[PDB]
């Protein structure tokens, strides 16, 4: 019913690793468009939204809608057994009890096969509204990781103001801020900061969660950060084409 082949297991390994500290249990919803995931974190503060499109596989076949109820700690144990450059195939029949994962070595004559027991997970699906955000920041993802990690050492909260963009915090040891200015880097585009702004924004967020979101930095050299006042943060990484991993974070109120 489902047969989905990844030329390189890398991407799925990195996605699950990027998600597993926010989300213990979740459904992988599979259809003809590809494999989607939507789940709130355990504390119902962040939402994780992923879409690996059919075109990202070679080949992809999903004859029917299939929900794969998975524990991510369990899935991580299995995915750790795939090397980054292994060929990875996901299989499942209609109304499945297990997910079948097959890893084929690209370096020697080794086939790994796992039948991962599925669980029953109650949907708890939310609609995400299509939003024209007040501000968008496209920056190097490693830069965003560095900022969130550094500020988290001194504070639990970061204020993000856009007009460039300033990340500020206050804590026991004192105050810290990091200001980024709009800059296109023609020779090293990966270094660029793009800010599209229709309206100034000022919002405060938990750093813990942002730092978790930056576990996804290995997926992409670019991150997109979208802000509106009284509206959740969107932190988005491209997974190639129109595939994506999105994190939504409610502001502190």
């Amino acid at each position: 019913a489902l047969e989905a082949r990844l030329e390189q297991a890398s991407i799925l390994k990195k996605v699950v690793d990027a998600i597993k500290d926010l989300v213990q249990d979740c459904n992988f919803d599979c259809n003809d468009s590809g494999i989607a995931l939507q789940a709130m974190d355990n504390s119902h503060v962040a939402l994780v939204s992923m879409m690996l499109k059919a075109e990202g596989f070679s080949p992809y076949r999903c004859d029917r809608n299939i929900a794969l109820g998975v524990n991510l700690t369990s899935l991580t144990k299995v995915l750790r057994a795939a090397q980054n450059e292994d060929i990875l195939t996901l299989k499942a029949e209609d109304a499945p009890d297990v997910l079948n994962l097959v890893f084929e070595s690209s370096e020697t004559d080794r086939i790994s096969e796992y039948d991962l027991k599925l669980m029953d997970i109650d949907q708890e699906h939310l609609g995400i509204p299509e939003t024209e955000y007040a501000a968008t920041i496209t920056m190097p993802s490693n830069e965003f990781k560095r900022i969130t990690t550094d500020l988290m050492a001194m504070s639990e909260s970061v204020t993000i103001e856009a007009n460039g963009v300033k990340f500020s915090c206050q804590g026991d040891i004192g105050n810290g801020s990091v200001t980024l200015r709009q800059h296109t880097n023609v020779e090293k585009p990966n270094e660029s900061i793009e800010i599209e702004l229709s309206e100034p924004v000022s919002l405060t967020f938990s750093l813990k969660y942002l730092v978790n979101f930056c576990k996804a930095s290995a997926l992409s050299n670019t991150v997109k950060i979208c802000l509106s006042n009284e509206v959740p943060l969107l932190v988005e990484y491209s997974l190639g084409g129109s595939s994506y991993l999105r994190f939504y974070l409610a502001p502190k109120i």
Binding site: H44, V45, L47, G127, V231, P232, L249, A250, P251, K252
Partner: peptide, 11 residues
Amino acid sequence: QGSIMSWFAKK
């Protein structure tokens, strides 16, 4: 600290 469910509704 708001809940994400204050902004995103069921379904």
